[PDB]
């Protein structure tokens, strides 16, 4: 199936995304830290990464910076921040999309499809 | 790089042209859906910024038609901001969607994502 990795410390968000993506027939992998997410990214061959930017071991922009040295996998970022400067930095660092919370699952799903079609 | 702006409102169309020319791009304009599609086919733009509220139809019709013959990235503008708005346009084939009002800096970062991904 399509493999999606979620990198997010916040347990409720992880569970919420996993249930939504599994129900659309995707295989979901999870990591709770930036460092573990990078390990899983290299391990699991995700077709897409949904990355929360507020992680306990660093700003998620550092995940993108590291990841982009060795992977072109699509990345959709999530943030509690709506600040324009944050959106610009994350996209310019290599994110493919950015959704500020709160957001609807339906929009996330549509944006997931764009990111997956384009790489197909 | 060539950008096609499909937008009947003169003010925002001019604002976008001068913003994008300021980053060194060449700008083409169209103020109806039909002329937009024709410009898109003849000028081979690297991207299209599409307003959904045109005098001769819904820009979703523009997108559906375009996508039979072109993979050029399309970023939609619209005053429409409901989630269902965004889902319909993305599913039709748009690459991104920004509701108005928006920050120019955010639009430009989103244009760059589309550029690097369609140069791959
Ligand atoms: Ca978090
Ligand atoms: Ca209009």
UniProtKB/Swiss-Prot annotation, chain A:
Which molecular function GO terms apply here? cis-regulatory region sequence-specific DNA binding; DNA-binding transcription activator activity; DNA-binding transcription factor activity; phosphorelay response regulator activity; protein homodimerization activity; transcription cis-regulatory region binding
Which of UniProt's keywords are assigned here?
Cytoplasm, DNA-binding, Phosphoprotein, Transcription, Transcription regulation, Two-component regulatory system
Record flagged with keyword Protease: no
User: Which cell locations does it reside in?
Assistant: Cytoplasm
Nucleus found in the keyword field: no
Supply the name of the protein.
KDP operon transcriptional regulatory protein KdpE
Query: What positions are modified (4-aspartylphosphate)?
Result: 52
Question: Domain Response regulatory spans what residues?
Answer: 3-116
The task this protein performs is described as:
Member of the two-component regulatory system KdpD/KdpE involved in the regulation of the kdp operon.
Q: Which gene encodes it?
A: kdpE
- GO BP terms, alphabetized: regulation of DNA-templated transcription
* Chief localization: cytoplasm
Modification(s) after translation? Phosphorylated by KdpD.
GO CC term, one of those recorded:
protein-DNA complex
Tell me the part of the parent protein that is shown. Answer: 1 to 120 of 225
According to the record, the segments passing through the membrane are none
